[PDB]
Structure 1
Amino acid sequence: FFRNMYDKYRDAFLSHLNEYSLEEEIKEHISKYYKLLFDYNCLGGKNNRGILVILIYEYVKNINSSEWEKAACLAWCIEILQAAFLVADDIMDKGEMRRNKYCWYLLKDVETKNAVNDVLLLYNSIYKLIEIYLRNESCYVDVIATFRDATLKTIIGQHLDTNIFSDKYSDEIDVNNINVPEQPVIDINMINFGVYKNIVIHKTAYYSFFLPIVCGMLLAGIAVDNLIYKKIEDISMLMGEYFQIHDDYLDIFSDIQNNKLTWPLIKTFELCSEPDKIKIVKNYGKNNLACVKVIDSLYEQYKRKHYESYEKAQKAKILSAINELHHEGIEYVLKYLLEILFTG
């Protein structure tokens, strides 16, 4: 039913913009543009984060029409957040396709300049929507703080993912250099699971798991002083890692060319001979067909099988963390979520 309510939240926000002191013709142009911005970018994903909110809310509470209206609001707000992350991420990473269609920023009628502005519109629409539907709820402030704090962590994780190999992170920033572009290179001191977990937990775990779970519980009426919140934070960290490692696995089976610190990169570096370390450093992070293939060949050489081995062990560690919650409703949801992560 979550998908049925999309139009309401979209139209609610667009109705706010329509109240502006603007000429009727100009209002028409913007409702056209912004309806598409939402539709193109909020619709078409697996909706795991949105569904997670709704499932957690239902399995803590055990629900009328207004209650679901607030739950579905927060669910779509996180999908709107994902949309904003998606648009921004594709600008930054100069992406080609997202969800089997052209990245928003690539479109002739959009371009990078609009996509930047649109990320901030999508991002700010979130808080207008929460205001519209949850202004008079007692959890109102805690909910917006949860979005804010999870977003800040995501920004920092995104920063680390972008810059972990950059010449600035190897051992001051030059405010006079606008002319000499730094060549993308690997930094071997950063190729380790400790650094990787830092990035992954901040970039993924907080907005993807912590935020949706907390929204559900917050709206349900679980007081923020409750000890479960810290347990859920710890579980969310484990799941975020699990999800991103799998995301890294799917990419190879544009991270190689984009010089990304991936789990496949770290595992390979851990497993490979010294000559192959030189081979990785020479061939990684380059937009060259021959270079990517060499990196592709090494992943095949050092066996795909190591991911499967990790996936089984991490899943077990999560189910153990889930079981110490001592909350049946959330436990089932988290066990169900864990099963349906990759499919949606």
Structure 2
Amino acid sequence: FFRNMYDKYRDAFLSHLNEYSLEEEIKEHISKYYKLLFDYNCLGGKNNRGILVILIYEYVKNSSEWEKAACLAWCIEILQAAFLVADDIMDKGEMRRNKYCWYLLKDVETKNAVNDVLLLYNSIYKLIEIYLRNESCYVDVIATFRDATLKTIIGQHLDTNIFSDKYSHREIDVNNINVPEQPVIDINMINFGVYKNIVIHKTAYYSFFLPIVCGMLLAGIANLIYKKIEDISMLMGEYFQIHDDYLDIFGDSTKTGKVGSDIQNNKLTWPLIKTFELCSEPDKIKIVKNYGKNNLACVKVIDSLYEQYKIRKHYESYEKAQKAKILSAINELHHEGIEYVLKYLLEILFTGV
């Protein structure tokens, strides 16, 4: 039903903008643009986050109560949209959900895309106000979105700068606008400790913690269960991001809906760390020389090393062991309702529905 409800939350927000003191023709233009900004970026995904709000709420506890839950559910889908528009600018994305990235469109470009990230982000809080301002969890829901957003921003910053020169005794150069940085990996950062730090922040909080907490706050949970949920969410985000990093190398872009770019974008990935952990000293030198380069021969070397050190096999073994670790933590929850949803989510996570 949540999928039918989409139009309702979008049109509620578009109606808010239509109340602005603008000339009728200008209101018509802004409606056309923003309807597309929402449809294009909120639709086409698995909707795992939104569906998770709906299920957690149902299994913790009418149409009026569903109107509030589906609002929160669509707000996380709007947050996903905001983060993916910004991520694709940052990661020089080509494709998103089998459509061109929003920032690439000649009618949009980076100039609109930056402004649109802020619009999508701010639409959430207007929608929570419209549907939940008189709820007791209202300020607690507002704070959950803000804290999970702040954590994602830090994660995105680490993902984007972990190998940067400013981090590899000297300070950021405020006088350099002409000498580009040559991306090189920092071997001191190639460890799972650093990787887990990035991954819990850029994915776990907004993808797992935020939807579960939304459903729980709305259903009325005040409680030490929230720390257990936080810990499961971290295990789940790590598991989900490792699979994503796997797909960037071994996935099919027609199936994933996006084009792989981590080797050329100098990302600290799970396949990188796993390879560094297993490979020979000359192969470490090969990685340093060829990683972080938007050049076919360079990415081919890295890709060949991922085949050589059987990264596909190590991932399969990781997934098996991490799913067990997640299930073991879920069993310690002592809440049958939440446990069913989380066990179910774990099964559909990579496929959706």
Query: Which TM class, normalised by the smaller chain length?
Result: over 0.9
d(CA) in 1 for partners of 2:316 and 2:89? 32
Does the residue aligned with 2:129 lie in a helix, a strand or coil? helix
Whether 1:198 aligns to 2:206 is no
Q: How does 1:14-93 map to 2 (within 5 A)?
A: 14-61=14-61, 64-93=62-91
Deviation string 1:39-84 (CA, Å, 9 cap, x unpaired) is: 00000001000000000000000xx111000000000000000000
How far residue 29 of structure 1 moved from its aligned partner, in angstroms, is: 0.3
What's the counterpart of residue 238 of structure 2? 241
Deviation string 1:310-331 (CA, Å, 9 cap, x unpaired) is: 1111111111100000000000
Give runs of ≥4 in structure 1 deviating > 6 Å.
none
How far residue 292 of structure 1 moved from its aligned partner, in angstroms, is: 0.7
What's the counterpart of residue 305 of structure 2? 298
Deviation string 1:292-338 (CA, Å, 9 cap, x unpaired) is: 11111100000000001111111111111000000000001000000
What TM-score does the superposition give when structure 1 sets the normalisation length?
0.98
How far residue 150 of structure 1 moved from its aligned partner, in angstroms, is: 0.1
How far residue 180 of structure 1 moved from its aligned partner, in angstroms, is: 0.8
Deviation string 1:11-64 (CA, Å, 9 cap, x unpaired) is: 000000000001001000000000000000000001000000000000000xx1
How far residue 137 of structure 1 moved from its aligned partner, in angstroms, is: 0.3
Does the residue aligned with 1:95 lie in a helix, a strand or coil? coil
Does the residue aligned with 1:200 lie in a helix, a strand or coil? helix
Deviation string 1:126-180 (CA, Å, 9 cap, x unpaired) is: 000000000000000000000000000000000000000000111x111111111
Over aligned residues, Cα RMSD in angstroms?
A: 0.5
Does the residue aligned with 1:212 lie in a helix, a strand or coil? helix
2:152 to 151, 154, 160: 154
d(CA) in 2 for partners of 1:283 and 1:312? 31
d(CA) in 2 for partners of 1:135 and 1:179? 49
Deviation string 1:274-297 (CA, Å, 9 cap, x unpaired) is: 000000111111011111111111
Deviation string 1:99-123 (CA, Å, 9 cap, x unpaired) is: 1010000111101100000000000
d(CA) in 2 for partners of 1:114 and 1:314? 40
Does the residue aligned with 2:333 lie in a helix, a strand or coil? coil
Whether 1:331 aligns to 2:339 is yes
d(CA) in 2 for partners of 1:31 and 1:108? 19
Does the residue aligned with 1:45 lie in a helix, a strand or coil? coil
- Percentage of matched positions with identical amino acids: 100
d(CA) in 2 for partners of 1:3 and 1:205? 24
d(CA) in 2 for partners of 1:112 and 1:167? 25
d(CA) in 2 for partners of 1:5 and 1:307? 37
d(CA) in 2 for partners of 1:207 and 1:15? 27
d(CA) in 1 for partners of 2:319 and 2:234? 15
Does the residue aligned with 2:266 lie in a helix, a strand or coil? coil
Deviation string 1:232-284 (CA, Å, 9 cap, x unpaired) is: 00000000000000000000001001110000000000000000000011111
d(CA) in 2 for partners of 1:111 and 1:288? 25
Q: Which runs of 5+ in 2 are unaligned?
A: 251-260
How far residue 92 of structure 1 moved from its aligned partner, in angstroms, is: 1.3
d(CA) in 2 for partners of 1:287 and 1:140? 46
d(CA) in 2 for partners of 1:110 and 1:313? 43
What's the counterpart of residue 127 of structure 1? 125
2:288 to 281, 285, 288: 281
What TM-score does the superposition give when structure 2 sets the normalisation length?
0.96
d(CA) in 2 for partners of 1:320 and 1:86? 31
d(CA) in 1 for partners of 2:14 and 2:175? 43
d(CA) in 1 for partners of 2:242 and 2:92? 22
Does the residue aligned with 1:222 lie in a helix, a strand or coil? coil
How far residue 93 of structure 1 moved from its aligned partner, in angstroms, is: 1.4
Aligned length: 339
Does the residue aligned with 1:123 lie in a helix, a strand or coil? helix
Whether 1:3 aligns to 2:3 is yes
How far residue 196 of structure 1 moved from its aligned partner, in angstroms, is: 0.1
How far residue 94 of structure 1 moved from its aligned partner, in angstroms, is: 1.4
